[PDB]
């Protein structure tokens, strides 16, 4: 094939790689399952994946889908206020990233005694001066990065902040561990670190390649 | 492999990472007995720095042992280490800061 | 020795004890306790320690070694309380299920942590106590004590099978309202005051220092205050009077006061002759407390009947029913 | 004075004892699974 | 007790072991572990086998059938069942039943208590003579 841009994502042990211009494949070989497809309606740009959902959007949109055990249902067609950068679906909640903002919204929502405090929230806080460069979602946390170097964990379940680190420079990429507690982030100068919020301290990763990507 | 020195290296690593139980399992096969009993003696310790100091002492790094012991709950253990290890000058130093009863007696021992 | 070579060691210890033996009985009993503590039978460890305590006090009947055996008696009693408490925590963190109510585990863990500050009797691993305490305080709603439990945990070496839960709880506990529910706050009964859940001094008030009197089922706080007798008064004298009708300054009830009470409101805890009977006024006579006449532990009356029925004995001493 | 507040606290802890034992008496404790 | 620890996560192996030994403690541990996994209809089987009447009566008082708990408490004399059964009627507001059944378990301090609360005067004599000093 002439060209196939390389997109895809990971959650636990569930690959969701791109197949072709109009397709995706979802599989969990680690737990012995089969490959499926979701034949996405457009040319996708980002492909998040998670326990129970896929997601593809190209310009300002995001077609969530439900990763069942049989088939996929075009859950919704929710949209965003800017160029959607890289959404990340783990568990139930989702967190799009459009124009230096991050907008935690519940996915499978029908207004059944669900507090509107929980439906939608927009980080960075309405008033502050940041641009969330990188966020990454865990079992229950909205770890994101900033420009003034603020790595705020955000416990979704009780809907409050739990951690405020402060890196000397703009944390610009983050990758949490599967368990969620510890973290790996890269600052501007390509200087990795391992932030472990429990004991609030960063350990430097020796001999870090200058062009690490992931 | 069935190499005694390879098992010994594994044992030193297992001491180094605070893996007391698995280190005991290794040593029980190596056969070294005067450390199997010691480790079974300090398997109860829960304090992080105190246990750190003990497992340091078992890896014959006494300086780091002192360093940790002075941060643990029971610093006088570093004293006990120095006094056993016969370095009575550091014994005076550590004791003076921690215990005054050892002072005249460790002074006597150092004089002798 | 016939039972001993027949391996009936419990009965054998009972025999030597009944046989005036004071070298075989103690040695076999200590060996049995060491076996029990080696395994997970902490409740039996507590019961054997309790037997040691009362037997050694019996031995202290000898005026020659009174001073050197009351110390052993007190030490073994404290160990008995600690181990019987710790058995519940050991069960809770091992079995896939849970047996006890959350309130009882919370109270047991708090009492243990406030009675085991810096020395750990063999086998009692306080990582489990703090873990149980953190879970239970977060469940019940004492969200400030849980913060302590986790901070204290941060300085101990955690076994790998607890690390994930503890290192995630330390993070998700900062989301809680930072407040201790009033339904759990301990209350003194000598001076009105509301001691912090985590009292540094141990199990003692702050304004006064009357140590709390804990029961023996749910390790709960009790409404009994320990008054002491006057100078020239005897136990027989005190009971006679009753029936007729910043350091610590212990209260000293005097005769005209002892003639102003009734057996409804005092628990006498008659110890053997070598010791002196210590007393316990009660401040809510409407509530009830029953005192096991063997081990002189105290329980809420209602609790003690369910416990006797369930076990067929006291739970602390396994005396006859 | 001090007497009034002291008696008030004595009554509060009275009530707590009552509700506690009521909780034991009128509720059963089904064996429940543990998280780990 | 040690074997359950070792065979935890070897649940089928445990099941084989506990169904073979027939010790009435391993049976009760398995009963606990088939009540803490929401399979309450085999808890009855293993508790039945492990002669734990207090527990059977408890489960029967949970699943609304209280005639069954009454049955398992009439014949087996296990007092603990009589206690928990009486408390079940207590929450059920049956008063004579929940008094007589405390009476069964020789637990007269709860009996006199509910009696005083209800106001049964005859109860005071019937459970004061029997009562301890
Ligand atoms: Zn007080
Ligand atoms: Zn007793």
UniProtKB/Swiss-Prot annotation, chain A:
Biological source species: Homo sapiens (Human)
Physiological role: As component of the IFT complex A (IFT-A), a complex required for retrograde ciliary transport and entry into cilia of G protein-coupled receptors (GPCRs), it is involved in cilia function and/or assembly. Essential for functional IFT-A assembly and ciliary entry of GPCRs. Associates with the BBSome complex to mediate ciliary transport.
Gene: WDR19
Annotated tissue distribution: Some isoforms are tissue-specific. Highly expressed in the prostate. Lower expression in the cerebellum, pituitary gland, fetal lung, and pancreas. In normal prostate, expressed in both basal and luminal epithelial cells. No expression detected in fibromuscular stromal cells, endothelial cells, or infiltrating lymphocytes. Uniformed expression in prostate adenocarcinoma cells.
Subcellular location: Cell projection, Cilium; Cytoplasm, Cytoskeleton, Cilium basal body; Cell projection, Cilium, Photoreceptor outer segment; Cell projection, Cilium, Flagellum
Stated induction or repression of this protein's expression: By androgenic hormones. Expression increased 3-fold in an androgen-stimulated androgen-sensitive prostate adenocarcinoma cell line compared with androgen-deprived cells.
Name of this chain's protein: WD repeat-containing protein 19
UniProtKB/Swiss-Prot annotation, chain B:
Annotated TM spans: none
Cellular compartments annotated: Cell projection, Cilium; Cytoplasm, Cytoskeleton, Cilium basal body; Cell projection, Cilium, Photoreceptor outer segment; Cell projection, Cilium, Flagellum
Repeat (TPR) residue spans along the chain: 65-98
Tissues and organs where the protein is expressed, per its UniProt entry: Some isoforms are tissue-specific. Highly expressed in the prostate. Lower expression in the cerebellum, pituitary gland, fetal lung, and pancreas. In normal prostate, expressed in both basal and luminal epithelial cells. No expression detected in fibromuscular stromal cells, endothelial cells, or infiltrating lymphocytes. Uniformed expression in prostate adenocarcinoma cells.
Superkingdom, taxonomy of origin: Eukaryota
Factors inducing expression: By androgenic hormones. Expression increased 3-fold in an androgen-stimulated androgen-sensitive prostate adenocarcinoma cell line compared with androgen-deprived cells.
Function: As component of the IFT complex A (IFT-A), a complex required for retrograde ciliary transport and entry into cilia of G protein-coupled receptors (GPCRs), it is involved in cilia function and/or assembly. Essential for functional IFT-A assembly and ciliary entry of GPCRs. Associates with the BBSome complex to mediate ciliary transport.
Protein name: WD repeat-containing protein 19
Organism: Homo sapiens
Full protein segment contained here: 672 to 783 of 1342
From Swiss-Prot, chain D:
Origin: domain of life: Eukaryota
Segments of this protein annotated with the region Required for association with the IFT complex A (IFT-A): 5-36
Subcellular location: Nucleus; Cell membrane; Cell projection, Cilium; Cytoplasm
Tissue-specificity statement: Expressed at high levels in testis, ovaries, thyroid, and spinal cord.
Disease: Hepatorenocardiac degenerative fibrosis: An autosomal recessive disorder characterized by progressive degenerative liver fibrosis, fibrocystic kidney disease, and hypertrophic cardiomyopathy with atypical fibrotic patterns on histopathology. Disease onset is variable, ranging from childhood to adulthood.
Role, per record: Negative regulator of the Shh signaling transduction pathway: recruited to primary cilia via association with the IFT complex A (IFT-A) and is required for recruitment of G protein-coupled receptor GPR161 to cilia, a promoter of PKA-dependent basal repression machinery in Shh signaling. Binds to phosphorylated inositide (phosphoinositide) lipids. Both IFT-A- and phosphoinositide-binding properties are required to regulate ciliary G protein-coupled receptor trafficking. During adipogenesis, regulates ciliary trafficking of FFAR4 in preadipocytes.
Family membership noted in the UniProt record: Belongs to the TUB family.
Subunit description: Associates with the IFT complex A (IFT-A). Interacts with SIRT1.
Designated name of the protein: Tubby-related protein 3
Source organism of this protein record: Homo sapiens (Human)
From Swiss-Prot, chain E:
Name this protein carries in UniProt: Intraflagellar transport protein 140 homolog
Illness association: Short-rib thoracic dysplasia 9 with or without polydactyly: A form of short-rib thoracic dysplasia, a group of autosomal recessive ciliopathies that are characterized by a constricted thoracic cage, short ribs, shortened tubular bones, and a 'trident' appearance of the acetabular roof. Polydactyly is variably present. Non-skeletal involvement can include cleft lip/palate as well as anomalies of major organs such as the brain, eye, heart, kidneys, liver, pancreas, intestines, and genitalia. Retinitis pigmentosa 80: A retinal dystrophy belonging to the group of pigmentary retinopathies. Retinitis pigmentosa is characterized by retinal pigment deposits visible on fundus examination and primary loss of rod photoreceptor cells followed by secondary loss of cone photoreceptors. Patients typically have night vision blindness and loss of midperipheral visual field. As their condition progresses, they lose their far peripheral visual field and eventually central vision as well. RP80 inheritance is autosomal recessive.
Localization per record: Cytoplasm, Cytoskeleton, Cilium basal body; Cytoplasm, Cytoskeleton, Microtubule organizing center, Centrosome; Cell projection, Cilium
Underlying gene: IFT140
Species per Swiss-Prot/TrEMBL record: Homo sapiens
TPR repeat residues: 24-57, 79-112
């Amino acid at each position: 094939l002439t060209k196939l841009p390389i997109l895809g994502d990971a959650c636990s042990t569930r690959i969701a790689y791109l197949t072709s211009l109009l397709e995706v494949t979802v599989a969990n070989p680690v737990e012995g399952e089969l490959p499926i497809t979701v034949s996405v309606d457009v040319e996708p740009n980002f492909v998040a994946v998670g326990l129970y959902h896929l997601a593809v959007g190209m310009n300002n949109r995001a077609w969530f889908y439900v990763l069942g055990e049989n088939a996929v249902k075009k859950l919704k067609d929710m949209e965003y206020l800017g160029t959607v950068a890289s959404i990340c679906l783990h568990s139930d909640y989702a967190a799009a990233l459009f124009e230096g903002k991050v907008q935690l919204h519940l996915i499978e929502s029908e207004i059944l005694d669900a507090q509107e405090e929980r439906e939608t929230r927009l980080f960075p806080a309405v008033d502050d001066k940041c641009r969330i460069l990188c966020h990454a979602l865990t079992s229950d946390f909205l770890i994101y990065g900033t420009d003034t170097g603020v790595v705020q964990y955000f416990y979704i379940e009780d809907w409050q902040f739990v951690n405020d680190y402060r890196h000397p420079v703009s944390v610009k990429k983050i990758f949490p561990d599967p368990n969620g507690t510890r973290l790996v982030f890269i600052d501007e100068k390509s200087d990795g670190f391992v932030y472990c919020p429990v004991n609030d301290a960063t350990y430097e990763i020796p001999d870090f390649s200058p062009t690490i990507k992931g | 492999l069935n190499d005694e020195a390879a098992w010994n290296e594994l044992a030193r690593a297992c001491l180094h990472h605070m893996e007391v139980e698995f280190a005991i399992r290794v040593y029980r096969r190596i056969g070294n007995v005067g450390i199997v009993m010691s480790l079974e003696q300090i398997k109860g310790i829960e304090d992080y720095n105190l246990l750190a100091g003990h497992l340091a002492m078992f890896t014959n790094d006494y300086n780091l042992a002192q360093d940790l012991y002075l941060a643990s709950s029971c610093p006088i253990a570093a004293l006990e280490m120095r006094r056993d290890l016969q370095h009575w000058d550091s014994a005076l130093q550590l004791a003076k800061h921690l215990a005054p009863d050892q002072i005249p007696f460790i002074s006597k021992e150092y004089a002798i | 020795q016939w039972l001993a070579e027949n391996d009936r060691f419990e009965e054998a210890q009972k025999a030597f004890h009944k046989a005036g033996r004071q070298r075989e009985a103690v040695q076999v009993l200590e060996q049995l306790t060491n076996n029990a503590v080696a395994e997970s039978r902490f409740n039996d460890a507590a019961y054997y320690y309790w037997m040691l305590s009362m037997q050694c006090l019996d031995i202290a009947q000898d005026p020659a070694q009174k001073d050197t055996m009351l110390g052993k008696f007190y030490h073994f009693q404290r160990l008995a309380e600690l181990y019987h408490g710790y058995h519940a925590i050991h069960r809770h963190t091992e079995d896939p299920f849970s047996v006890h109510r959350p309130e009882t585990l919370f109270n047991i863990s708090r009492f243990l942590l406030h009675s085991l500050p810096k020395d750990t009797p063999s086998g009692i691993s306080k990582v489990k106590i703090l873990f149980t305490l953190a879970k239970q305080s977060k469940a019940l709603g004492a969200y400030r004590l849980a913060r302590h439990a986790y901070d204290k945990l941060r300085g101990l070496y955690i076994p790998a099978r607890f690390q994930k839960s503890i290192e995630l709880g330390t993070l998700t506990i900062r989301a809680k309202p930072f407040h201790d529910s009033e339904e759990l706050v301990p209350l003194c009964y000598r001076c009105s005051t509301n001691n912090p859940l985590l009292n540094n001094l141990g199990n003692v008030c702050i304004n006064c220092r009357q140590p709390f009197i804990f029961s023996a089922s749910s390790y709960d706080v009790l409404h009994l205050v320990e008054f002491y007798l006057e100078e020239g008064i005897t136990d027989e004298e005190a009971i006679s009077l009753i029936d007729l009708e910043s350091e610590f300054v212990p209260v000293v009830v005097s005769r005209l006061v002892l003639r102003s009470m009734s057996r409804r409101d005092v628990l006498i805890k008659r110890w053997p002759p070598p010791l002196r009977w210590q007393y316990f006024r009660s401040l809510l006579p409407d509530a009830s407390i029953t005192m096991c006449p063997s081990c002189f532990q105290m329980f809420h009356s209602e609790d003690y009947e369910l416990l006797v029925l369930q076990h067929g004995c006291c739970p602390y001493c396994r005396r006859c029913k | 004075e001090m007497m009034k507040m002291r008696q008030a606290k004595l009554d509060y802890q009275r009530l707590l004892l009552e509700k506690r034992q009521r909780k034991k008496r009128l509720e059963p404790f089904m064996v429940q699974p543990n998280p780990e | 007790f040690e074997v359950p620890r070792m065979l935890s996560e070897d649940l089928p192996s445990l099941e084989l072991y506990v169904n073979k030994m027939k010790d009435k403690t391993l049976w009760r541990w398995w009963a606990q572990y088939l009540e803490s996994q929401g399979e309450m209809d085999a808890a009855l089987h293993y508790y039945e086998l492990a002669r734990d009447h207090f527990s059977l009566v408890r489960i029967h008082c949970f699943q609304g059938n209280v005639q069954k708990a009454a049955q398992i408490a009439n014949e087996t004399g296990n007092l603990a069942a009589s206690y928990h059964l009486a408390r079940q009627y207590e929450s059920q507001e049956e008063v004579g039943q929940a008094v007589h059944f405390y009476t069964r378990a020789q637990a007269f301090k709860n009996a006199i208590r509910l009696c005083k609360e209800n106001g049964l005067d005859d109860q005071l004599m019937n459970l004061a003579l029997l009562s301890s000093p």
